[PDB]
Design a protein around this ligand. Sequence first.
Ligand SMILES: N=C(N)c1ccc(CNC(=O)C2(NC(=O)[C@@H](CC3CCCCC3)NCC(=O)O)CCCC2)cn1
Lengths: 10, 34, 250
Amino acid sequence: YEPIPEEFAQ
Amino acid sequence: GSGEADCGLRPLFEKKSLEDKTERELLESYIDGR
Amino acid sequence: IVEGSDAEIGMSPWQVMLFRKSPQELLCGASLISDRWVLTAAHCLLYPPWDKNFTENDLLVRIGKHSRTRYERNIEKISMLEKIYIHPRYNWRENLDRDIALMKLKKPVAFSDYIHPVCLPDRETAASLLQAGYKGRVTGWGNLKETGQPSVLQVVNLPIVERPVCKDSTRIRITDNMFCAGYKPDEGKRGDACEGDSGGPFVMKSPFNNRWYQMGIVSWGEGCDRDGKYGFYTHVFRLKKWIQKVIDQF
Ligand SMILES: N=C(N)c1ccc(CNC(=O)C2(NC(=O)[C@@H](CC3CCCCC3)NCC(=O)O)CCCC2)cn1
């Protein structure tokens, strides 16, 4: 899987 | 009604009166065939 | 999905992908029923036999997707979970009876050409379409063979099967909150859901008002696409009242 942006890690 | 107005109506299909490749196989089975 | 084909763009605007934060991997399918709620199978979040017990801050919801592994920028939307709700009488000990769960999103999702909600059935719609012979559609990024994965969203059309035939194909005690689907061994065609499709939607198009309704949820099966074997789904209308309940309370 392609990494998803960090701003979505809460 | 039971399911907000607009539900089940796809933007790229029903909303523009376009059928997808296999949705008819479904409707043809709603009587007797399969 | 076994023996299906690549879904076309916007073909299932309500398809949802349950995504694990760490490690970053696919977890289950699910469906969008409003701008704040997604429906899925309870065993996707809770299953003690495998020590599986996920919490809100453990997953992410990805809506509007087509590709299985790419971060479809500008098209897909990623949302966080505010609260998860498992059916109080979910039976993971015996036969997975009442395999269903609701997820409340932290923020309302904005609809688009690739993001749109499916309808929940009413008594009339279920009574007209939920009949043996009538075909339905299943979609998911799950495996393609019982024992590689798909690159793009998969989809198959399967016929609903007579209850008796369902019972005589398994040792698992079948309940009223379930129904099976798939082609019989002599019917020529085939296809089925499989590992990774769990939680996904089983939908039918109403020939009365042209809308799509989610009649079932991918729950369980014995292997994938085996002759004499059928996939089982959670009977959404039977659990409809618990659903309305959870929604107007929270
Ligand atoms: N339509 C299908 N063929 C199909 C296959 C697989 C799935 C995904 N779900 C699963 O794998 C789960 N397990 C299964 O299906 C089990 C059978 C369950 C029956 C109810 C009590 C627990 C065991 N079969 C594994 C297999 O023999 O493989 C794992 C936790 C419960 C469900 C969904 N649909």
